[PDB]
Amino acid sequence: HMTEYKLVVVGAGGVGKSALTIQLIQNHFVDEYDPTIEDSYRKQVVIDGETCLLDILDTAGQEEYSAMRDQYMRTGEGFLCVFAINNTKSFEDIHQYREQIKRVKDSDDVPMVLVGNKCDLAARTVESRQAQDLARSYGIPYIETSAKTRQGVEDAFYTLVREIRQH
């Protein structure tokens, strides 16, 4: 049996967080997606020469079901805490998402990664340095990704798989 990594995407709604996982799962020249099918959330990958399976949970759209976070969150080995670089509120919400993950996992050390997504050509309101500082305070990596161009996506996920392996 190959190693299967259960990853959980968390973050504010209404700011394109769904793009991150979509762009990972779909091929680089395949812009089609059917969230209905099984292949749409499981992906075989080779990271640092060691093959594995990535099972990704992104509940994009279910933000109002706030009492379901703990349940959804407890299923994960590692977490992608996503915010939008054009939305300060989504950045300000990461502190609580992280405090929730820690409370659910009953641990101060949870494999976790901070992701700053650029979902449109709207004005950046969060400077990479603010985000890099925050990630350092928490002691986790920071990755920036582009929804338009697929830049950063693979690094965001692979950095988390590396964080799980080194835990």
């Binding site: 394109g16 769904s18 793009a19 979509i22 779909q26 089609e32 997606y33 059917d34 969230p35 209905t36 749409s40 992104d58 509940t59 994009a60 759209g61 279910q62």
Partner: peptide, 9 residues
């Protein structure tokens, strides 16, 4: 989630 991901993806 399926409507959102269909529209975004």
């Amino acid at each position: 989630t399926n409507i959102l991901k269909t529209e975004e993806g």
